[PDB]
From Swiss-Prot, chain B:
Protein's cellular compartments: Mitochondrion matrix
Name of the protein described by the UniProt record: Lon protease homolog, mitochondrial
Family that this chain belongs to: Belongs to the peptidase S16 family.
Organism: Homo sapiens (Human)
Phylogenetic classification of the source organism: Eukaryota, Metazoa, Chordata, Craniata, Vertebrata
Signal peptide residue numbers: none
Subunit structure: Homohexamer. Organized in a ring with a central cavity. The ATP-binding and proteolytic domains (AP-domain) form a hexameric chamber, while the N-terminal domain is arranged as a trimer of dimers. DNA and RNA binding is stimulated by substrate and inhibited by ATP binding. Interacts with TWNK and mitochondrial DNA polymerase subunit POLG.
Binding site for ATP: G105, P106, P107, G108, V109, G110, K111, T112
UniProt disease link: CODAS syndrome: A rare syndrome characterized by the combination of cerebral, ocular, dental, auricular, and skeletal features. These include developmental delay, craniofacial anomalies, cataracts, ptosis, median nasal groove, delayed tooth eruption, hearing loss, short stature, delayed epiphyseal ossification, metaphyseal hip dysplasia, and vertebral coronal clefts.
Coiled coil: none
Tissue expression pattern: Duodenum, heart, lung and liver, but not thymus.
Domain-level remarks: The Lon N-terminal domains are crucial for the overall structure of the protein, maintaining it in a conformation allowing its proper functioning. The AP-domain (ATP-binding and proteolytic domains) has a closed-ring conformation in the presence of AMP-PNP and its N-terminal entry gate appears closed. Upon ADP binding, it switches to a lock-washer conformation and its N-terminal gate opens.
Function: ATP-dependent serine protease that mediates the selective degradation of misfolded, unassembled or oxidatively damaged polypeptides as well as certain short-lived regulatory proteins in the mitochondrial matrix. Endogenous substrates include mitochondrial steroidogenic acute regulatory (StAR) protein, DELE1, helicase Twinkle (TWNK) and the large ribosomal subunit protein MRPL32/bL32m. MRPL32/bL32m is protected from degradation by LONP1 when it is bound to a nucleic acid (RNA), but TWNK is not. May also have a chaperone function in the assembly of inner membrane protein complexes.
Length: 178, 175
């Protein structure tokens, strides 16, 4: 099989055991090569998604409070309490030795610097950035898509296709609460 | 099997055993790694997860109850006295299941921590789930297995987490 060894070469990164046995069994099912169009390609796409979602991949966070404060200042003019809370959030994690990934909600009048301070924070913590907009989201298939049995199902893109930033700790901004 | 030793350790009821072996034979007509396979897999996992006879021994002792209550909280002498009265009445009656206790008062007085203190005092397993405008039953009873969103619900999740047939369930913010 041509693509089998290619997928095997791709998934060299640290994969948990359950994902690994699932992808091994999927490789074994596709290795039968029962056909070349329909049942081959559904498992092929499942395999490509499994090998594309990065497992154990991280991004070296910036632990330097001075640099984080500097870059917040470069981005925005003084949102003093906001930036103090971001720095205190960084310091509590640097104390606990491992972060907790707390959910922070920013509320206030329009145009006050809510959405862009998120990109600022992402650059400060050396994470990858990504932006939802849940307002006007009416179907659940956006956060988690349709099962693979349906014809054109996408892997619940806005969360899993998010993970194709090659990083397990990206900062995700959920835009609104409408 | 994993599920077999699971049910072998704990006292299963007869109808449950019948249904689980029925669904296990229904999977025996293998439909490997599909929707109708993973549905059966999750069903049997929840079934072997639920504790069936195993429970936690209680402690209706007033002395230890008082010690726990005075340790976990400061002040609140009258609430502690009401809790001790409930415990004594429930020891007499033996059932400890008659009327539901409900603490009310201003916010921030720690009426949610009294539930944890009571769980410690009765040596039960604690569990909390809030009801703020849920408007649905799927939180309590859950969903059907047909829906792609298939969850047992708050009660079964409490049972699977506590691994105990007689836990303490706090219900927050009824009002
Ligand atoms: N303190 C600030 N310093 C520098 N630029 C700012 C500041 N506040 C707002 N801006 C700029 O003004 C624009 C306003 O966008 P903003 O991020 O405020 O949208 P928002 O707060 O999400 O508004 P809405 O809630 O209406 O969507 C941004 O492009 C931002 O660059
Ligand atoms: N008498 C007390 N002793 C110890 N902690 C208390 C006391 N009263 C309140 N608390 C604290 O208050 C917090 C819980 O507040 P709570 O009364 O549960 O608010 P709400 O009633 O709105 O849920 C807990 O962290 C608890 O430690
Ligand atoms: Mg915005």
């Amino acid at each position: 099989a041509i693509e089998e060894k290619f997928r095997e070469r791709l998934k060299e990164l640290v994969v948990p055991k359950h994902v690994m046995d699932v992808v091994d069994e999927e490789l074994s099912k596709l290795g039968l090569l029962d056909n070349h169009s329909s049942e081959f390609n559904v498992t092929r796409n499942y395999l490509d998604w499994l090998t594309s979602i990065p497992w154990g991949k991280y991004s070296n966070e910036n632990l330097d409070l001075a640099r984080a404060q500097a870059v917040l200042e470069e981005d925005h003019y003084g949102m003093e309490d906001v930036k103090k809370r971001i720095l205190e959030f960084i310091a509590v994690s640097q104390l606990r030795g491992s972060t907790q990934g707390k959910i922070l909600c920013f509320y206030g009048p329009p145009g006050v610097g809510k959405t862009s301070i998120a990109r600022s924070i992402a650059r400060a913590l050396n994470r990858e950035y990504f932006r939802f907009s849940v307002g006007g989201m009416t179907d659940v298939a956006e956060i988690k898509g349709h099962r693979r049995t349906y014809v054109g199902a996408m892997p619940g893109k806005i969360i899993q296709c998010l993970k194709k930033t090659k990083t397990e700790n990206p900062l995700i901004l959920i835009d609104e609460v409408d």
